[PDB]
Write an enzyme that holds these catalytic residues in place. Sequence first.
Site, mmCIF file in Angstrom:
data_model
loop_
_atom_site.group_PDB
_atom_site.id
_atom_site.type_symbol
_atom_site.label_atom_id
_atom_site.label_comp_id
_atom_site.label_asym_id
_atom_site.label_seq_id
_atom_site.Cartn_x
_atom_site.Cartn_y
_atom_site.Cartn_z
ATOM 1 N N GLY A 1 1.748 7.198 4.908
ATOM 2 C CA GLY A 1 3.071 6.722 4.499
ATOM 3 C C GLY A 1 3.040 5.630 3.417
ATOM 4 N N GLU A 2 3.493 4.414 3.743
ATOM 5 C CA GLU A 2 3.434 3.256 2.818
ATOM 6 C C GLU A 2 3.557 1.914 3.567
ATOM 7 O OE1 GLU A 2 7.860 3.324 1.181
ATOM 8 O OE2 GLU A 2 6.437 2.616 -0.359
ATOM 9 N N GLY B 1 1.115 5.807 0.101
ATOM 10 C CA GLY B 1 0.600 7.178 0.191
ATOM 11 C C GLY B 1 -0.449 7.437 1.262
ATOM 12 N N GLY C 1 0.864 -1.193 0.000
ATOM 13 C CA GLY C 1 0.000 0.000 0.000
ATOM 14 C C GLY C 1 0.892 1.231 0.000
ATOM 15 N N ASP D 1 -13.203 4.636 10.180
ATOM 16 C CA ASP D 1 -13.062 4.623 8.739
ATOM 17 C C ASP D 1 -13.187 3.235 8.157
ATOM 18 O OD1 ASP D 1 -12.706 5.938 6.230
ATOM 19 O OD2 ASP D 1 -10.520 5.881 6.482
HETATM 20 C C1 LIG Z 1 -4.828 -0.073 5.452
HETATM 21 C C2 LIG Z 1 -3.383 0.034 4.972
HETATM 22 C C3 LIG Z 1 -3.559 0.172 3.437
HETATM 23 N N1 LIG Z 1 -2.742 -1.276 5.350
HETATM 24 C C4 LIG Z 1 -2.546 -2.294 4.516
HETATM 25 C C5 LIG Z 1 -1.944 -3.295 5.235
HETATM 26 C C6 LIG Z 1 -1.593 -4.624 4.692
HETATM 27 C C7 LIG Z 1 -1.726 -4.821 3.334
HETATM 28 C C8 LIG Z 1 -1.498 -6.098 2.809
HETATM 29 C C9 LIG Z 1 -1.626 -6.376 1.355
HETATM 30 C C10 LIG Z 1 -1.935 -5.338 0.445
HETATM 31 C C11 LIG Z 1 -2.036 -5.617 -0.927
HETATM 32 C C12 LIG Z 1 -1.866 -6.918 -1.389
HETATM 33 C C13 LIG Z 1 -1.996 -7.224 -2.880
HETATM 34 N N2 LIG Z 1 -1.965 -5.917 -3.559
HETATM 35 C C14 LIG Z 1 -0.671 -5.506 -4.110
HETATM 36 C C15 LIG Z 1 -0.738 -3.988 -4.210
HETATM 37 O O1 LIG Z 1 -1.804 -3.636 -5.130
HETATM 38 C C16 LIG Z 1 -3.108 -4.068 -4.679
HETATM 39 C C17 LIG Z 1 -3.110 -5.578 -4.418
HETATM 40 C C18 LIG Z 1 -1.592 -7.940 -0.480
HETATM 41 C C19 LIG Z 1 -1.477 -7.677 0.876
HETATM 42 C C20 LIG Z 1 -1.140 -7.128 3.646
HETATM 43 N N3 LIG Z 1 -1.020 -6.921 4.966
HETATM 44 C C21 LIG Z 1 -1.236 -5.724 5.502
HETATM 45 N N4 LIG Z 1 -1.107 -5.669 6.855
HETATM 46 N N5 LIG Z 1 -1.935 -2.877 6.493
HETATM 47 N N6 LIG Z 1 -2.385 -1.635 6.568
#
Ligand SMILES: CC(C)n1cc(-c2cc(-c3ccc(CN4CCOCC4)cc3)cnc2N)nn1
Length: 258
Positions: free
Chosen positions: A18-19, A15, A13, A118
């Site tokens: 942060g990221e 922006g 993720g 949210d």
């Molecule tokens: C809410 C904020 C955005 N966040 C995300 C996460 C988080 C995200 C992911 C995650 C995000 C995207 C994907 C797959 N994608 C690649 C980027 O293209 C969209 C699909 C897989 C896992 C896994 N584990 C977390 N803990 N934690 N906090």
Amino acid sequence: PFVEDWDLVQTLGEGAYGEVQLAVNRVTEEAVAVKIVDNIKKEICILKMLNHENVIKFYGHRREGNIQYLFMELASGGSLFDRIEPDIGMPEPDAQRFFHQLMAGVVYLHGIGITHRDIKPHNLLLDERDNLKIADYSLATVFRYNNRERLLNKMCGTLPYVAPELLKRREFHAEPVDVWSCGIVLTAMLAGELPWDQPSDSCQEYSDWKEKKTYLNPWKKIDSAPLALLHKILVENPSARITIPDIKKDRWYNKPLK
Ligand SMILES: CC(C)n1cc(-c2cc(-c3ccc(CN4CCOCC4)cc3)cnc2N)nn1
């Protein structure tokens, strides 16, 4: 691309706050997620409270000069957002399951006196067994402490998900605001579309709903049983809105599904 034992291998993720990086430990091969940011004191403090299967686990944090690192459970399924087909939704039984898991998450948060503020599909992540986890505590806040409720006043969240009281009231109760957003999530799952830009008397789609014009989209794509629940959730007056204990008694909520 390394903090102590961990390598920051790719972006999950970007922006939003942060990221978010995939962090793989080069020694142990264990993989987690890391949120990287250039308020955070509050977020970290709330994050340390969270212990529930439908909430994202906090592992710990490391500050390295300007940059803060928040180590969290990895949800390798990615987001609910990506499982919703635009204009379609998803199969009703998968929607029901996710909704059950979302309610379990929210009950847990509310029970520790935390409001997320949210809730929306971007913030609802999926583990590799498709278990839902409520993520992102950057807007979260305490609404109950030493058994005394405090009303909220900050306007925050995401407009298509926010409850109408948040746009009209100087102060409002936290819990019905999170319930409302769960109902817009349920709509999105079942119809692949959001019902309105915002819940204001100047928004035509919201007026249509209040006038029960359910022969319009997105309502006409939704079966009558989940629709009856959405009628109890998306109620304009927050004191008349269904509470979670009562959601759990609803007919569609308890309907056995494929
Ligand atoms: C809410 C904020 C955005 N966040 C995300 C996460 C988080 C995200 C992911 C995650 C995000 C995207 C994907 C797959 N994608 C690649 C980027 O293209 C969209 C699909 C897989 C896992 C896994 N584990 C977390 N803990 N934690 N906090």
